[PDB]
Amino acid sequence: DDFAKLEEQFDAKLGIFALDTGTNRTVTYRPDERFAFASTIKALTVGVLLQQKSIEDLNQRITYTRDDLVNYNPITEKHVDTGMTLKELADASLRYSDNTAQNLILKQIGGPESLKKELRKIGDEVTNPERFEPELNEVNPGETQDTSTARALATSLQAFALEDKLPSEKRELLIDWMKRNTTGDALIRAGVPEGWEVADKTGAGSYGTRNDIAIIWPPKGDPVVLAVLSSRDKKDAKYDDKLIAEATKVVLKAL
Amino acid sequence: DDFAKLEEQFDAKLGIFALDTGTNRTVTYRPDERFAFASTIKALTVGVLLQQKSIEDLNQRITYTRDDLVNYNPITEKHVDTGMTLKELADASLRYSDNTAQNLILKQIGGPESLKKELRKIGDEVTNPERFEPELNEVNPGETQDTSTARALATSLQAFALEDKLPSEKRELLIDWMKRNTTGDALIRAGVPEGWEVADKTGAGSYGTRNDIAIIWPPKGDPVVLAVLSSRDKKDAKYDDKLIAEATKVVLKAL
Numbered sequence: 001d002d003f004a005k006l007e008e009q010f011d012a013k014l015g016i017f018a019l020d021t022g023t024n025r026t027v028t029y030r031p032d033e034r035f036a037f038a039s040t041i042k043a044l045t046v047g048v049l050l051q052q053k054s055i056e057d058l059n060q061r062i063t064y065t066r067d068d069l070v071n072y073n074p075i076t077e078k079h080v081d082t083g084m085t086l087k088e089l090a091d092a093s094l095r096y097s098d099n100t101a102q103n104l105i106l107k108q109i110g111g112p113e114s115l116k117k118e119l120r121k122i123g124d125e126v127t128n129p130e131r132f133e134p135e136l137n138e139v140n141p142g143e144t145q146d147t148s149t150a151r152a153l154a155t156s157l158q159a160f161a162l163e164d165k166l167p168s169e170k171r172e173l174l175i176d177w178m179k180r181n182t183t184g185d186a187l188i189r190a191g192v193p194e195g196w197e198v199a200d201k202t203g204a205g206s207y208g209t210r211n212d213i214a215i216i217w218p219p220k221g222d223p224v225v226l227a228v229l230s231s232r233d234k235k236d237a238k239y240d241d242k243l244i245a246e247a248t249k250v251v252l253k254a255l
Numbered sequence: 256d257d258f259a260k261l262e263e264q265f266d267a268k269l270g271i272f273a274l275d276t277g278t279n280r281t282v283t284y285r286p287d288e289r290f291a292f293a294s295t296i297k298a299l300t301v302g303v304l305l306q307q308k309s310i311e312d313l314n315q316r317i318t319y320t321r322d323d324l325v326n327y328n329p330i331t332e333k334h335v336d337t338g339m340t341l342k343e344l345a346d347a348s349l350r351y352s353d354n355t356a357q358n359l360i361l362k363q364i365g366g367p368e369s370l371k372k373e374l375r376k377i378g379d380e381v382t383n384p385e386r387f388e389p390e391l392n393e394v395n396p397g398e399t400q401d402t403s404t405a406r407a408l409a410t411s412l413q414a415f416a417l418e419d420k421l422p423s424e425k426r427e428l429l430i431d432w433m434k435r436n437t438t439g440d441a442l443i444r445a446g447v448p449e450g451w452e453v454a455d456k457t458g459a460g461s462y463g464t465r466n467d468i469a470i471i472w473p474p475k476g477d478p479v480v481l482a483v484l485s486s487r488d489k490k491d492a493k494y495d496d497k498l499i500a501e502a503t504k505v506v507l508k509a510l
């Protein structure tokens with residue numbers, strides 16, 4: 001198997017689950033092994049937000065302070081004195097992986113416990129959110145807090161983006177934001193053939209954790225749901241995006 | 256494995272594909288091996304019919320003669336003088352496996368050729384309908400005519416009954432008919448625990464081909480799509496429903 005060779009090449013552990021919704025053909029590799037989900041959780045968080053809010057509710061202006069700012073706030077730190085609407089916060093969270101935006105949206109839906117409850121409701125019995133950004137990124141081997149699996153993350157993404165968990169109008173909003181993600185050019189997007197459309201959400205955490213979950217659309221055909229997770233054995237280890245791009249190539253080849 | 260043992264005991268070949276839609280967990284065994292689909296095709300045919308006709312169109316009365324009757328017409332024979340509406344015909348085809356009903360419906364949708372085209376349009380590139388009832392049941396080893404695989408049949412059933420290939424209103428019509436099927440008590444239904452709901456369509460063909468495709472709802476949880484196909488080596492070989500009931504038990508345990 002090619003995935004094992006990639007693990008050797010990049011000295012990392014891989015977690016993969018891909019599902020061609022048109023044929024029910026799958027590609028898996030350690031699909032049920034837990035990995036810190038890191039920022040990929042931002043996609044599922046907006047999914048839940050869209051479940052509880054009407055489109056007009058998203059125009060609601062949210063105010064916050066420099067006090068509310070965490071470690072990575074590309075968009076939010078530029079509007080502290082003006083506040084941002086929920087819609088703008090969802091945009092910043094998904095497309096720029098803005099940590100404060102994720103925290104503000106998390107508070108809007110009830111916190112991590114409420115997020116977990118809502119996920120259990122849609123059938124996700126694996127994803128275990130417990131903290132806010134950025135501490136959620138610090139997970140030690142063996143711990144299950146703030147972790148999930150490639151199969152669970154792909155399935156929950158599929159539930160919100162392709163299934164009936166959300167009305168079409170809201171599904172479209174989520175897909176549009178993710179299609180326009182600015183942080184994943186070197187990951188799944190780098191591993192698919194040209195002409196293929198990608199909607200993804202990246203993540204990076206401790207122990208060199210580097211993830212990307214996506215819905216990919218071949219030129220002609222049904223979407224493919226893909227979750228590629230990875231981690232290394234050193235807490236301070238550095239990741240290599242090439243690992244995800246290569247893993248994606250194998251998946252495409254396989255499918 | 257358990258499936259290999261069942262094949263030896265019953266001197267048969269098993270084709271199995273099961274998918275838990277809530278977790279994307281699957282159970283497979285020769286999922287891509289071709290088997291004559293036999294009467295399981297009746298469920299796919301109704302799916303295409305509901306795609307073309309409106310709920311009103313279903314009341315469209317269809318008239319036929321004793322000439323239109325084939326080898327197995329439990330319902331259509333007792334209605335040759337008054338005709339039957341498309342809805343009653345779909346009912347007869349799905350719940351009683353009425354051969355004349357299937358043929359009349361096939362004609363309604365344009366014949367085997369149109370059915371195949373329609374299936375190709377929803378992503379099914381495997382199912383190969385070519386004939387009418389009852390000839391379609393006669394398939395020789397090596398032929399692809401009127402054959403499909405467990406994976407394709409399950410996926411196509413899921414598309415019509417669980418996916419947005421049909422408006423909720425029509426999906427429930429199909430599910431209702433299949434839930435009240437009268438021909439499969441000794442098959443998948445005999446292999447599920449108490450409290451589990453089943454919507455299935457049976458099939459029997461030459462070479463001892465005995466199939467059952469279904470959607471199963473556990474007491475609590477998302478539906479499971481399951482296709483259990485089987486065949487023997489001798490043209491006139493007899494089938495045993497116990498094989499399917501037993502195979503279903505393994506699938507459930509695995510899930």
Ligand code: NA
Pocket residue numbers: 204
């Ligand atoms: Na980073």
Ligand code: NA
Pocket residue numbers: 459
């Ligand atoms: Na029979």
